[PDB]
Scaffold this motif. Structure first.
Motif, mmCIF file in Angstrom:
data_model
loop_
_atom_site.group_PDB
_atom_site.id
_atom_site.type_symbol
_atom_site.label_atom_id
_atom_site.label_comp_id
_atom_site.label_asym_id
_atom_site.label_seq_id
_atom_site.Cartn_x
_atom_site.Cartn_y
_atom_site.Cartn_z
ATOM 1 N N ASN A 193 0.692 5.404 0.823
ATOM 2 C CA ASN A 193 0.026 6.320 1.175
ATOM 3 C C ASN A 193 0.021 7.521 0.311
ATOM 4 O O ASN A 193 -1.067 8.308 0.184
ATOM 5 C CB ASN A 193 0.406 6.818 2.554
ATOM 6 N N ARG A 228 -2.327 6.236 -2.390
ATOM 7 C CA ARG A 228 -3.691 5.815 -1.700
ATOM 8 C C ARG A 228 -4.295 4.564 -2.110
ATOM 9 O O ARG A 228 -5.281 4.380 -2.594
ATOM 10 C CB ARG A 228 -4.829 6.891 -1.878
ATOM 11 N N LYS A 229 -3.341 3.682 -2.636
ATOM 12 C CA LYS A 229 -3.769 2.469 -3.294
ATOM 13 C C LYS A 229 -2.442 1.305 -3.214
ATOM 14 O O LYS A 229 -1.615 1.995 -2.746
ATOM 15 C CB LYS A 229 -3.877 2.616 -4.883
ATOM 16 N N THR A 230 -2.987 0.042 -3.260
ATOM 17 C CA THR A 230 -1.696 -0.910 -3.639
ATOM 18 C C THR A 230 -0.891 -0.343 -4.681
ATOM 19 O O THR A 230 -1.421 -0.214 -5.876
ATOM 20 C CB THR A 230 -2.319 -2.195 -3.561
ATOM 21 N N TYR A 281 0.868 -1.167 0.023
ATOM 22 C CA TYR A 281 0.018 0.109 -0.153
ATOM 23 C C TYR A 281 0.635 1.292 0.021
ATOM 24 O O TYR A 281 1.816 1.398 0.725
ATOM 25 C CB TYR A 281 -0.846 0.204 1.192
#
Length: 555
Positions: free
Chosen positions: A349, A352-354, A347
Motif C-alpha cells: 500500500n 502502490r504496486k507489487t 502488494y
C-alpha cells in the motif's frame, strides 16, 4: 587525475565539452594541455611535488578543482593538492563474511574530536565489544564540516576536516593492528549539489533518468565508457591507496544501467578481483543484487534488508507513518526471520504496486539487519533513537532479535551502551538557495524542526558516551553468544509464535521473546545463557510457563 612517474608526473583530465584547458599549478604556472579526440586533456610535468596545489582553467577561463582530486585542503571550492601516493595494500582482507558484525560510525559526531583520530581512540572499546568491522559513513569531500556525507562531491578526496588522507590511512592501519576491518560507505548513484564541477566538463550525468536524488551517473549512453571508468577506478583507488576491507554501496536502486553488463556487476568484479567485500543498500527486495552470476545476479556479497528493521520497529513502536504502514504485525517479524523479505512479491500500500521477489536458498550472510542506523534515526524529523520509543525490555528484546538472527548484524554507533541523544540530519552548505532548499525540504518531508544548517543541530547529535552498563553488558554478551552458538548465516531456524510472544529455535539454542506477559508452551530443554531480567530459570524443561515481558536465551 595525476600519476607520479619517477620524478615526473602526468595530469589527465576528461573534458569532452571543453575546447581548451590549461593546468594551473598555484604559484608555478599555467601550462597548455594536449587534447585527444575522445576528450582527454593531458600533460607530463617535471617540476611538481607532494603538497603542490592545482587547478584547471576552462574555455571560459573559470577555474575548477580536479573532479578526480585526491585531496581538497581548503574545501569543495579550493584547489586540489598532490598527495603522497603510498600505494601499499594486502591482497586479501582478513575479514570473513560469516564473522562479520558491523559498527556504523559517523566520524564527525562519533567522538568529541570529530575526526579519524577520535575513532582510533575508540578502537579498543570496539574490539572489546566484539565488533569485527567498522563501517565508515561517506568521507568523499563534501561541503563544510557538517554533513552525514551523502553530499560528497569529490569521490577520491578524503574529507579535509575529518583528518584528510593521512588521518584515514592511519585509521585503517590502526584498525588492522587491532584486528578490525574497515568498510567504506561510497556513493555512486549521485553527487552532491554544491562544489560539483563535472557538468562543465562532460556528460557525467544521465539525461535519461531521474532518481529520488535527481540526476544520476551516465553509465549507458554516449561517452559513458569514461564515466564507468571513473567509478570503477574509484573502487580500485580506495583498495590500493587506502587498504580498505570493503564497501557499502549507497542506494543501488538509484544506479541505473541498461548495458549488457550492469555497472553493479562490474563494481563487484573489481572488489572481488582484489579479494574484498561489498554490501549493497537496496530498496528493490530483489535477490539479483546478491545472487551469483550463474543465477543472473550481480554477485554482491550482501544487501541491507530494511524489512527486518521495519518489522521490528513498527511492531514494537506501534508507528505506521511512512513505510511503517506496510508493517506492524508480529507475523511480519516471523516472515522476515524465515523468508528474509516481508515484501517478496506481495502488494504494498505504501508503494502502490507489487514489490519484491523471494530470495530462495541464499544463506544468512547475503543480508544485513539492524534495529538502528543513520537513516532509521536520522530521517525522523526529531531524530529519536529507538531507545526513546519503546521501554527497556522492548529495547533489549529488539537487540536480541537482530543480534541472534542468521543475518549479518549492524550496530549503530551508541546503540550498544544505550545512547539517548538524537541523530539529526545536518548540513553545511554555503549557497543560500541550497541552504533554503534543505531547511524547507527537511521540514516538509521529515517534520524536522531543528535547523539542519545550524551547528547546534550537529552538536546535539554527537554521542554522549554516557555508558548504561546493563545495556552494554547485554550487547557484549549477545555478541559473544552469537559466535559461540554458531548462529551466523544459518537460516535453519524454527519459529513458533502466539499473540504476544515468539520462540525461535536454531541448531544450538532457542530464544524466548515475550512481549507481554503470557503463558507459553516450551518444547525445549536448555540452560540459560543470557536474559533481559532475572525472572528466567537457570535450567528449563519442556513445559507450560507463565512469563513476564522479557527475553531469555537458552542452551
Amino acid at each position: 587525475a595525476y600519476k607520479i612517474d619517477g620524478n615526473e608526473v602526468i595530469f589527465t583530465l576528461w573534458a569532452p565539452y571543453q575546447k581548451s584547458v590549461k593546468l594551473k599549478v598555484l604559484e608555478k604556472g599555467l601550462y597548455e594541455m594536449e587534447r585527444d579526440e575522445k576528450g582527454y586533456f593531458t600533460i607530463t610535468l617535471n617540476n611538481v611535488k607532494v603538497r603542490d596545489r592545482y587547478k584547471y582553467v576552462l574555455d571560459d577561463a573559470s577555474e575548477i578543482p580536479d573532479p578526480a582530486s585526491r585531496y581538497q585542503p581548503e574545501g569543495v571550492h579550493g584547489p586540489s593538492q598532490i598527495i603522497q601516493e603510498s600505494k601499499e595494500f594486502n591482497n586479501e582482507t582478513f575479514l570473513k563474511k560469516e564473522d562479520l558484525i558491523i559498527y556504523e560510525i559517523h566520524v564527525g559526531t562519533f567522538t568529541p574530536e570529530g575526526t579519524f583520530e577520535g575513532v582510533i581512540r575508540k578502537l579498543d572499546y570496539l574490539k572489546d565489544l566484539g565488533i569485527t568491522a567498522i563501517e565508515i559513513m561517506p568521507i568523499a569531500q563534501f561541503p563544510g564540516k557538517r554533513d552525514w556525507g551523502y553530499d560528497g562531491v569529490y569521490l577520491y578526496a578524503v574529507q579535509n576536516s575529518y583528518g584528510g588522507p593521512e588521518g584515514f590511512r592511519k585509521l585503517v592501519d590502526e584498525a588492522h593492528k587491532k584486528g578490525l576491518g574497515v568498510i567504506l560507505d561510497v556513493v555512486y548513484n549521485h553527487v552532491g549539489p554544491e562544489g560539483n564541477y563535472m557538468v562543465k566538463l562532460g556528460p557525467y550525468f544521465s539525461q535519461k533518468y531521474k532518481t529520488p536524488w535527481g540526476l544520476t551517473f551516465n553509465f549507458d549512453d554516449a561517452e559513458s565508457d569514461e564515466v564507468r571508468k571513473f567509478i570503477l577506478e574509484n573502487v580500485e583507488y580506495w583498495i590500493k591507496e587506502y587498504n580498505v576491507d570493503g564497501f557499502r554501496l549507497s542506494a543501488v536502486h538509484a544506479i541505473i544501467d541498461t548495458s549488457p553488463k550492469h555497472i553493479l556487476e562490474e563494481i563487484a568484479d573489481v572488489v572481488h578481483k582484489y579479494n574484498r567485500i561489498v554490501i549493497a543498500e537496496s530498496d528493490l527486495n530483489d535477490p539479483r543484487v546478491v545472487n551469483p552470476k550463474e543465477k543472473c545476479g550481480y554477485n554482491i556479497d550482501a544487501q541491507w534488508v530494511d524489512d527486518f528493521h521495519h518489522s521490528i520497529h513498527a511492531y514494537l513502536t506501534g508507528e505506521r507513518q511512512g513505510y511503517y504502514t506496510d508493517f506492524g504485525n508480529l507475523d511480519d517479524i516471523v516472515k522476515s526471520y524465515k523468508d528474509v523479505f516481508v515484501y517478496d512479491g506481495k502488494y504494498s500500500n505504501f508503494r502502490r504496486k507489487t514489490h519484491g521477489e523471494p530470495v530462495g536458498e541464499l544463506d544468512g550472510c547475503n543480508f544485513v539487519v539492524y534495529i538502528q542506523n543513520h537513516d532509521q534515526v536520522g530521517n525522523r524529523g526529531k531524530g529519536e533513537r529507538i531507545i526513546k520509543l519503546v521501554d527497556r525490555e522492548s529495547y533489549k528484546i529488539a537487540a536480541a532479535l537482530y543480534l541472534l538472527s542468521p543475518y549479518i548484524p549492524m550496530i549503530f554507533m551508541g546503540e550498544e551502551y544505550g545512547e539517548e541523544n538524537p541523530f539529526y540530519f545536518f548540513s553545511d552548505f554555503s549557497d543560500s538557495k541550497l541552504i533554503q532548499g534543505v531547511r524547507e525540504g527537511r521540514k516538509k518531508e521529515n517534520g524536522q524542526d531543528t535547523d539542519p544548517q545550524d551547528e547546534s543541530t550537529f552538536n546535539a547529535s554527537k554521542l554522549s558516551w554516557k555508558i548504561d552498563e546493563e545495556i552494554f553488558s547485554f550487547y557484549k554478551i549477545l555478541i559473544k553468544m552469537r559466535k559461540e552458538l554458531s548462529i551466523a548465516c544459518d537460516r535453519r531456524v524454527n519459529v513458533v509464535n502466539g499473540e504476544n510472544w515468539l520462540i525461535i529455535k536454531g541448531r544450538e539454542y532457542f530464544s524466548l521473546y515475550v512481549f507481554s506477559k503470557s503463558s507459553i508452551e516450551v518444547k525445549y530443554s536448555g540452560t540459560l545463557l543470557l536474559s533481559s531480567n532475572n525472572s528466567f530459570p537457570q535450567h528449563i524443561e519442556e513445559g507450560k510457563y507463565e512469563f513476564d515481558k522479557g527475553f531469555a536465551l537458552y542452551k
